Structures are given as C-alpha cells and as structure tokens.
C-alpha cells in the first residue's frame, strides 16, 4: 500500500509529480493524506467528488491486437488466435494461455495452431476474459455469453493502467483518500503513465476548495 | 441518544453549529438541555413553540428517481422499475429490493427485469412504501391503496433527513427539549445537512424569549 | 454464546461490522445488549420487530450440486449420486455419507458406485435430508416422503449461513436480543458473510426508534 | 481418565484437535465438560444425542489377516493359523497366543505348526475371540458357537480404535459427557486416529444447539 | 492555506508586495492577521468593508478565444470548436475536453473534427461551463440553458485569477481576514498578477482607519 | 521449511525472484508471510484463491523415457525395461530399481535383462509407480490395476517439480500462506525452475487486491 502526503500550499515545504512503481497484473492500494492542506481550512473536511485522469507519457504501442467474441448461454464457443498478431518479420507463433490470467467462468483448450475452445460454465451469462501471449506479446480476448434471449452489449477493453470505477473513498474525520490502482497484464515494462487527482475540500457553509496533484506510474517488471 | 447543552448567552463559555452523526435508515433521539439559558430567566420555563428547519450544505444529487403509483383496495398492482434509472453511461441494472426496507402492508415479488408485483394486504387501505436499489443507488416507490370509492391523495416523498411532524416535547420542569431525528435509507454517505432550532422560553407574564442554534448532521455510513 | 454490546449513538465510544467466527455444522447462540442505546430513550424498551439479512462478501462457489427427490410413505427410494459432481478435470469420485450428518428418519446404504437406498422410517411422512461428500466437496440431498395421498411441496435447500425462522426474542426488561446462528455443513472454510440486524425500540406512546448494525461471519474450519 | 474442557465459542480463549494417548489393549474413560459452552445458553442442558466418528490419519496396514470360524455347541473346533500370514519375504512363523488376550469361554492348545484346537466351554453358545501373534504381527480369530439348532450370524471384526456402542452418558446437571475409548490389541504403535464428537444442547423450548470438536488419538506403545 | 501577517505601521519592522504561488485550477484559502496593526488602535476591530483589485503585471495573451452559447431547457445543443483558434502558422488541431474540467450539469461528446454535443441534464436550467484545450491552449465555453420561457442573460467569462464575490469574512475578536483565491484552468504558467487589499478598522466611535497592502500572485505550474 | 517475507509494495525495501534449493526425491514445505503487504490494507486478509505456475529456465532433457502399463486386479503384470533407453552411443545397460523409490502396493523382481514382474498386492485396485535407473538416468514406470470390470484411465506422469493439487492454505488471522513443494526423483541436478504465485487479498466489501511474486527452484544434488 502506497501512502502519500500532499503538499500543503503554504509557500513552503526530480520531476513534478511523485512516483508509483507498478507490476503487470497487480492490483494495489493507494492512500493520500490531505491533512496538511485541508486541516487549516477548518470546515467539513473532504468530500466524495474526486476526479482521476490517466495519460501516457511513454506507451510502446502493443504488437498483438485484442479481440471480442460472442456466444449464447451454454453453447460452446470457438475462435482463432492468429489474425491477432500482424507480424512485420518472419517468425513462428508460440500461442500461449497463461494459467495466472486464464478465464473466470469457463475453460479454454488451446489447440495446436492458434485455435481454442471456450466452453462457458454451465448456468452462467455474463462477460469473461482471458489473456493470451502470442510470442511474448500479451493481449486479451473478451467473450460475452448471452442469456439466450437477445444479445449482450460490448465491454470497453480494459486499459493498461486503470483506477476502478467505484472503490474510492474519503474519511472526512482524518482527511485521507483511498483508491485502488490496477495494472493490466498487458502493460509493457518500462512505460510511464500519469495520474492526475482533483480533490475538493469544503468550507463550513458548503463552498469548495480544489486541490490538484499528479503521480507518475512507471510500469516495471519484477516489482 | 444525543444530549446537547445549549450555550447560555452570558458573554462567556471548529464550526459554529455542533455535530450529529447519522446512519442511513436509523431513527435516533436528541435531547437539548436549555437549563443554562432559561433557568436564570426565572419564569415559566420552555413552551411548545419550537420550530425546525433542514437545509443541505452538501447533497450529492440522487441518481435514481422516485416514483408514485396508485391502486384500489384488494386489487393487485403492477409497475416497472427501469424508467427510474436514467443512466449516463453503459451498464447493467441489478434491480434489488432490500428486505430491511421492504413494504409494510403488502408483498413485492421482484421480477427478472425491473418488474414487480405489489399485492396489497387484504382488508387494508392506506399508503405503503418500499425502497429499491437499482445498482447500488437507492430510491423509494410510494403506493397508495384506495378504499374502493374515490381516489387517495399523494404523500410528499420523504426527504433524506427529517424531523417527525409531532414527536417533540419540552418538560418546563427541567428545561429539556426532546425531538426525534430520522434518516431516510436513501441518504448518501458523506453529505452534510444543517438543522436550525428556534426555541421560545416565556416570562412570568407570558412574554417571549427566543433562542436559536444549529446542528450539523453529517450522513455517515457504518455508524 | 457470543455477546455483543451495541454502540450507543452518542457521538462517542479494523472493519465497520464486528466479527463472528463459525464452524461448519455448528448451531450457536448470539446475544446483543441494546441497553446502552435504548435505556436513555426512556420508554417501553425493545419490540419483536427485528429484521435480519444475510449477504456474502466471499462465497467460493460450490463444486457439487444439491438434489431433490420424492417418495411416498413406506416405499423405498433410490437415487444416484454421480450427476451431482460435474468435474472439470480427470479424477475419481470417493462418494461418502458422513455419519455426523446422516439422515434423521431413515437409513442410507451407500453403494459401490454413486448409488444409495433411502428406506424411510416406517410410519413417517415429512422431509428428510442428508449431506454427502463427493471427493471432499459437500452438498445435500433432500427427500420428501408423502402421506400416500397427493404429493408434498418442495423445501428451499438450506443456505450456508442462516438465522432460524423463529427462535429470536427480546426481553424489554433488560434490553437484550437473542437469536440463533446456524452454519450448514456445506459452508466452505475461509468464506465471509455479512449479517445486518435492524432493531426497533419504542417510545412510551408507541412510536419507533430504529437501530442498524452488522456482523461479519467468517466461516472458519476447526473452531 | 482423560478430562477435557471444550472451547466456549465466545470469540476468545499445535494442531486443531487435542490429543489422546492410547496403548494397545487398554480401555480407558474420557470426560468432556461442556459447561463453558452450554451454561450461558440457559436451557435444559445437554441431551443424549451425541454422535461419534473415527477416521484414520495414519494406519500402517496390517500384515496378518483376521479370520472367522463357526461351530455348534459342545463340539470341538479346529482351524489353521498359517493362511492368515501372506508373507512377502522368506522367514519362519513363530505362532503365538498371548495369555493376556486369550479366549473368554473356551481354551486353545496351540500346536507345533499353525494349528490350534478351541474346545468351547460346556453349556455355552455365543461368540468368542482370541488374539494371535504370527511373528510379532497381531490379528484376531473370531469363533461363533451355535445353540445346535440353526446357525449364528457373523460379528463385525473389532476395529483398532472404537467407542463402545452404548456406554455414553451426559449429566445435564453439570454439563459433562462421559464415554469410553477402547483400543484393540492389534493397533500398531505410532498410528494416529481422529475422533469427532457432535453434541447437542437444547433450549428451554426444546430446539437445538450443535457443537463439534475432534480429538487425535495417537496409538503409542508403553503408555 | 496561506497565512500573512501585516506590517504594523510603527516606523519599524525583494519586491514591495509579498508573494503567493498558484496552480491553474486550484481554489485555495488566504488568511491575513491584522492584529499587529489594529490591536493598538483599541476600538471595535475590523469591519466587513474590504475591497480587492486584481491587475496583471505579466499576462501572455491567450491563443484560443472563449465562446458563449445558448439553449432552452431539455433541448440538445450543438456547437463548433474550430473558429475559436485563429492560428498564425500551419498545424493541426487536437481538440480535447479534459475530464477534470468537464461540464457540471450536462455531458459533451467531442466529435472527430471540432464538434461537440452538450446534452443538458434533464430538469435543469442555469449556466454551465467546460474547458476545452485546442492544441495545448485552454479556453472555456459557456452555455446557458433557459427555462423554456424567455431567454437567460450572459455571464461574465471568468478571469484567470479571481476573488470570489462573497466568501470573505473578518473576526473582529482576533483581527483576522479570510478570503478565497481561485485560479482559472486557463491561467498560463509564468504570469504574475497583483492583488491589492484595502481593509478598514474602526474606532470606538465608529470612525475609520484604512490599511492597504498588495500580494503578487505568480501563476506556477506544478505547485 | 522455507520461510519467505513478501515485499510490501511501498516504493521502498542478484536476480528478481528469490531462491529455493531442492533435492531430488524430497517433499518440503514453504511458508510465505504476506503480513507486510496485506496488513495495511485493513480488510478481511487473504483468501484461498492462490494460483501457481511452474516453468523451466534450464531443463536438460531426460535420457530415458517413461512408460505406462495396465493390468487387472490380482493378475501378475510383466513388462520390459529396454525400449525406454534409446542410446546414442555404444554401452551396456545396468538396469536398477532403487529401494528408496520402489513400488507402493506391489513388488518388482528385476530380471537379468531389462525384465521385471510387478505382482500387485492382493485385494488392491488403483495406480502404482516405481522409479527405475537405466545406467544412472532415472525415469518412472506407471502401472494401473483395474477392479476387474472395465479399464482404468491414465494418470499424468508426475513432473520434475510440482506443487501438490490441494495441500495449500492461508490463515487470514496472521497473513501466512502455506504450500508444499515436491521434487520428483527424476529431476536432474543443476536445473532451475521458476514458480510464480498469484495471491489475492480482499477488502472489507469483498473486492480484490492481487499480488504476484516468483521463486527460483534450483535442483541441487546433496542438499
């Protein structure tokens, strides 16, 4: 768990935005202590109006494309895993499904040549993912299983670094913001992303005090 | 039970208005001891002319709308639960009826898709509520069952924080005001409301001494 | 017997909801002392309008399915015990009927291969259960014996953690709530469930004071 | 006599199951004091619905097989003692009948080579056992003497560790369970068995409170 | 929170006006302690007749113009985002709507080419802003939604540095002035503005003592 | 028993993955203490959703092939031990059956020339292995004895380094993961394997915190 203390905007105490190291596949937790800034502003503390933004400062575009499939409940799904690796050069394709990042409500039998069968778990209808690795390069395959009636919609293909939709909170009693920071298994080591956090305090009549800071998430491998 | 002692207006002993923590769904009790202020004013003590006012200092507008239905006595009532959640984004709707806040004189069978049947209890005609939770966000559905003749009127859709119409009292013998403070199940944690209390003492000829104070009700979750 | 004291809602004295350890198969007893909250509210104490709700915070879906059978009075019942274990992988099936959780008004002779004979006790018509263990994983088989005339209805397949329908009580004389907490033999160790209790006090004119708390039931093995 | 106090399920005070040392041939007595658990549950104390189960955690399969014979009343019985020791290797067979574990209503004259004559006691018809030791390894021979009319049935070949069918009792006046624990003379030193006890208390209306614990019986030699 | 102590005008203890660092988008709080000047003037302390003035000492004129639109309640509003960037040179226009400074009661879907749709939030009539960034340079777009009857007036296009209309106060009990200092998201880093504060004390007959000071607000980026 | 403490992901304190020495034939135990990482994440501790993966970083392909045979219950089984050693060069074949790794429910009489007789233990039907050593190089022979009816399936030929299917556990009370690490007798000294462990903590609402680490298992001989 990371713990940061914010700069208190007094006119007093290498880059601008502080650093967060991350490993592909992890889901860590970050705590930010606004006490130094929001305590002198004697009021009602923090509020749940935080806003986050992720932007890449170094990306290294991915090699293998992601893909989306669709199936009804109970019916076995097939698909290919070879049109997802447009290769520039000449080489062979060691298709691989890592057991750490396999599916969640199904099973996949990787074939001999870029083929795989996803038998969805019986009595289940939702969305399911798994992360393949075509020759070292990792991507994800997203399958949505329908409840036999119409058709399911299409989920947004998880990004390398993300901040879960609603797992954030603030205790106005001690001025501490908690949020989760998850790294996809397809994040390439060496990249750098930037997270900007806009947090509002509140004065005792309910007006607003805004505070902005950033963090530099550097995707490392091996910790 | 909260117990507050009022400031005695002598010229002597972070915000202005003191604090009251509240949890969604509770109904607590508050006691205020005017002894320090109204005892030196040797007279006939307090009177039952208290006035309350609720105002929000932080609200976080609700996501799901509330709704009103109507039915005659004995006839089963249907309705929908999907036009009450205008969603900005793309997501699914896990309609839920909490058993803690179910109906009071009926039964509701939540369907598969935002549908529900409220069979009113036999030999009963009044108003009945229940609190649904469309994907975490809570609202209320109000149904009024008519005694088969004309039509019932329309109740005012309980607010997040309220002070029951008539459950207040004052013992002029010890200068203590009692009132109840109820929090709706739809109050969003982190909000802050402000309650202003205007209490009149009385002098021994029947003239008036007014006293005003506030309390800051901060809707917390988990106590 | 667990004994909890409730927080008195004064504005004064790791998770939110306190903890209850449980062992699969037990049936324990819990006592909650509302004295700290309901005594200052000088009135008629607690009432028998408690409401409970169980929700899982970690479930670990079961491997072996449960099953339901039916038989008339006196006639011996057969059934299979092999279509209740859809296995992903390749392995053998050591069908087992634990003597601690055998039937109650019958006898079962487990066969060599997933077969069993439930001879219902003579002159008896009701419902009867027993808990099998197909290769470590436990489920229940429910049989209903009919009184030879029509057909019996179908009971609801006991859940991992439950609170018996009517074994709850409150002594308004000392503000203490008693209830029973039972754990099915199929509860998987390591899971966590959450119990929410909504208890109403009453004021001396019969109005209501609601109080809500939770408890985190963590299914442990070996105590 | 062993005396155990049970853990009271309060959320308070190397393996899970406590230990019982046992010596081959003994028959000891065990007392369990449920006072710490069943006294707060003010009710009608314990009931005589205890259930036991024995399972091996280490067995060391026996070398010499057991055997069953049959004879009518008064007629002398012969048998062999050499087809009961399938030996892997080459060695000689020192057949021995220990005087501590001889027969009970007969006499046996061990021959020179694995032969023996069991002359049943005159005017007696029942079942009779004796424990031989073919080269250190112990087994039992069971003979049933018939009352000259038909044929006697076949008894179940006593296990290494057992809990006698009906010698158990509970005093609801002090919450103490008594049971007997017997070890066969053929139990191999160093083994470990596990005994699980399921004891029910009862509430004052007759409902049930279940309690489960285990004990690890470690077959030692020499105490 | 900034805290300044004023010079006491005794004839005793690089630029003239002290310094305040500011970051684009923030809203901070400033406290000025007139105790050193207004305490010797034994009287009735400070009064709420403070006057502020903002003047730029370095501005760096903006590149992209701001804009104003108008719409009635409920009707979706369109507009362009390309006539707001008169470019001197040849380059492309990466239109961007930052999520930190998006709208407040609507939603905007930025198109492919400088187009955007602002669907106002249902049941809402007021003014709404959002800050776009045409190729690094930031400006604001102001939309006013009318309550279907006539037409709304036109708000004054928030300046880079401002002092909120009425959030200022003075405690005559300790001679401390509080005011808020907000920085627009379009303030260009490196600029310098000057704030002049004219504060009046009061003598015990109600006459006046004026005091003037300045502060140099230097718009920095990254704190 | 190995004991590792995990790195706590704070941004603070030759290869990446730590080291585990192993000896062919052993079965050791490993303990990992997640306290440093999962304790600050005040929640419900670890869960039983660990995932392991073994991959070789140096293998040294085996010389002698493994083999599979089949027999019914009670019938003696023959087989050869010479087509399992395709030799490149010219040399003789000192067939050997180590007594440390002999069979478990049978006996094998190694012949003069690569022949052997496996007489299965009477009254036994399962799978049985033994490890031969054709001229220093070790492999395994797997025999499955059928219960005379149909045919048994075919077990998966144990790998050099493995992690037993279900002998893993986690005590959420002290944040410690236990698992077993077994090394086959055919592991070649000097090889290196890599074990990756993916462990999930859980927050107090039941969401997830993932943690990944590796260990480098270096097959040594003589400790």
Q: Which of F42, F153, F202 sits opposite C90 (nearest CB)?
A: F153
**Among residues D102, D138, D141, which one has the least CA distance to residue D121?**
D102
Buried b (16+ CB within 10 A) or exposed e, E175-196: bbbbbbbbbbbbbbeebebbbe
Q: How far apart are CA C211 and CA C38, in angstroms?
A: 9
Say whether residue C55 is in contact with chain B using an 8 A CB cutoff.
no
- Chain F residues with CB-CB distance to C189 below 8 A: 48
Q: Which residues contact D168 (CB under 8 A, 6 or more apart)?
A: D48, D50, D177, D178, D179, D180
Say whether residue A42 is in contact with chain B using an 8 A CB cutoff.
yes
The residue of chain C with its CA nearest to that of F169 is C190
> What does residue B38 show for φ and ψ, rounded to 5 degrees?
-95, -10
Return the structure tokens found at D55.
């399972």
> What does residue E102 show for φ and ψ, rounded to 5 degrees?
-75, -170
Q: How far apart are CA C86 and CA E76, in angstroms?
A: 54
Question: Do C27 and D210 lie within an 8 Å CB cutoff?
Answer: yes
The number of residues making up chain F comes to: 223
CB atoms within 10 A of CB E165: 7
Say whether residue B20 is in contact with chain C using an 8 A CB cutoff.
yes
Q: How far apart are CA B118 and CA B106, in angstroms?
A: 6
Question: Using CA of residue C72, residue C74, residue C80, residue C86, what is the dihedral sign?
Answer: positive
Q: How far apart are the CA of C204 and the nearest CA of chain F, in angstroms?
A: 38
**Among residues B58, E178, B221, E26, which one has the least CA distance to residue A44?**
B58
CB atoms within 10 A of CB A34: 24
> What does residue B4 show for φ and ψ, rounded to 5 degrees?
-120, 145
**What are chain B's partners, defined as 3 or more CB pairs within 8 angstroms?**
A, C
Say whether residue C23 is in contact with chain D using an 8 A CB cutoff.
yes
What letter would DSSP give residue D165? T
**Residue E195 bridge partners (DSSP):** E54, E215
Q: In whole angstroms, how far apart are CA A139 and each of A81, A85, A159, A184, D19?
A: 11, 10, 11, 10, 54
The residue of chain C with its CA nearest to that of F41 is C14
Question: Do B58 and A204 lie within an 8 Å CB cutoff?
Answer: no
Query: Is chain B touching chain D, with at least 3 CB–CB pairs below 8 Å?
Result: no
- Chain F residues with CB-CB distance to C57 below 8 A: 44, 202, 204-206
Are the C-beta atoms of residues F184 and F159 closer than 8 Å to each other?
yes
Strand pairing report for F18-22 and F2-5? unpaired
HEC letters along F93-156: CCCCECCCCCCCCEEEEECCCCEEEEEECCCCCCEEEEEEEECCEEEEEEEEEECCCCCCCCCC
**What are chain C's partners, defined as 3 or more CB pairs within 8 angstroms?**
B, D, F
Q: How far apart are CA E20 and CA A131, in angstroms?
A: 51
**Among residues F109, F114, F62, which one has the least CA distance to residue F83?**
F114
Q: How far apart are CA C2 and CA B210, in angstroms?
A: 50
Question: SS3 for C30?
Answer: strand
Q: Which of C10, C16, C53 sits opposite B100 (nearest CB)?
A: C53
Q: How far apart are the CA of A209 and the nearest CA of chain E, in angstroms?
A: 5
Q: Which of C11, C40, C210 sits opposite B26 (nearest CB)?
A: C210
CB atoms within 10 A of CB F122: 11
Return the structure tokens found at C138.
């436990």
Q: How far apart are CA E39 and CA D31, in angstroms?
A: 84
Question: Do A167 and F209 lie within an 8 Å CB cutoff?
Answer: no
Q: In whole angstroms, how far apart are CA D147 and each of D45, D72, E70?
A: 46, 6, 113
CA within 13 Å, CB half, B142: 14
Q: Which of C16, C41, C198 sits opposite B1 (nearest CB)?
A: C41
Say whether residue F205 is in contact with chain C using an 8 A CB cutoff.
yes
Q: Which of C8, C10, C210 sits opposite B25 (nearest CB)?
A: C210
**What are chain A's partners, defined as 3 or more CB pairs within 8 angstroms?**
B, E, F
Q: How far apart are CA F99 and CA F187, in angstroms?
A: 18
Q: Which of F48, F172, F204 sits opposite C15 (nearest CB)?
A: F204
Q: How far apart are CA D127 and CA C99, in angstroms?
A: 27
What letter would DSSP give residue F166? T
Q: How far apart are CA F118 and CA F78, in angstroms?
A: 6
> Cα B158 to chain center, whole Å?
6
Question: Do E2 and A10 lie within an 8 Å CB cutoff?
Answer: yes
CB atoms within 10 A of CB F91: 9
Report chain C's C-alpha Rg in angstroms: 22
Query: Is chain C touching chain B, with at least 3 CB–CB pairs below 8 Å?
Result: yes
What letter would DSSP give residue C82? S
Strand pairing report for F51-58 and F192-202? antiparallel
Query: Which parts of chain D fold into alpha helices (H)?
Result: 35-38
Indicate the resolution in Å.
3.0
**Among residues F48, F51, F79, which one has the least CA distance to residue F66?**
F79
Q: How far apart are CA B23 and CA B190, in angstroms?
A: 10
Q: In whole angstroms, how far apart are CA E95 and each of E113, E133, E135, E136?
A: 8, 6, 6, 9
What is the secondary structure of chain E as a DSSP string? -EEEE----SS----SSEEEEE-TT-EEEEEEETHHHHTTS-SS-B-S--EEEEEEEE----SS--EEEEEETT--EEEESSTT---SS-------B-STT--SSEEEEE-SSSEEEEEEPSS--SEEEEEEEETTEEEEEEEEEE-SSS---------SEE--TT--EEETTTTEEEEEEEE-TTPPTT-EEEEEEEEEEE-TTS-EEEEEEEEEEEE-S--
* Determination technique for this entry: cryo-EM
Say whether residue F206 is in contact with chain C using an 8 A CB cutoff.
yes
The residue of chain C with its CA nearest to that of D38 is C1
Q: Which residues contact A119 (CB under 8 A, 6 or more apart)?
A: A76, A77, A106, A107
Are the C-beta atoms of residues E6 and E213 closer than 8 Å to each other?
yes
Question: Do A42 and B90 lie within an 8 Å CB cutoff?
Answer: no
């Amino acid at each position: 768990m990371y713990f940061f203390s914010v700069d208190p905007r007094n006119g007093a105490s290498s880059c601008c935005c502080e650093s967060i190291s991350a490993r592909p596949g992890e889901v860590n937790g970050v705590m930010v202590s606004y006490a130094a800034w929001s305590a002198p502003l004697r009021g009602h503390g923090l509020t749940n109006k935080t806003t986050f933004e992720i932007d890449g400062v170094s990306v290294t575009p991915p090699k293998v494309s992601n893909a989306f499939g669709r199936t009804k409940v109970g019916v076995v799904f097939e698909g290919t895993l070879s049109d997802l690796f447009p290769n520039p050069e000449g080489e062979q394709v060691e298709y691989e499904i890592s057991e750490l990042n396999g599916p969640s409500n199904g099973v996949v039998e990787l074939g001999a040549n870029g083929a795989f069968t996803y038998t969805p778990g019986a009595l289940f209808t939702g969305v399911d993912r798994f992360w393949f690795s075509i020759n070292g390069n990792i991507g994800e395959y997203v399958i949505s299983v329908d409840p036999t009636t119409s058709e399911l919609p299409q989920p947004p293909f998880t990004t390398p670094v993300y901040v879960p939709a609603a797992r954030r909170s603030v205790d106005p009693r001690t001025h501490v913001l908690k949020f989760v920071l998850g790294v996809s298994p397809a994040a390439i080591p060496g990249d750098v992303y930037r997270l900007t956090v806009r947090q509002v305090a509140i004065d005792c009549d309910g007006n607003e005090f805004v505070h902005i800071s950033c963090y530099d998430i550097s995707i490392g491998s091996c910790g």
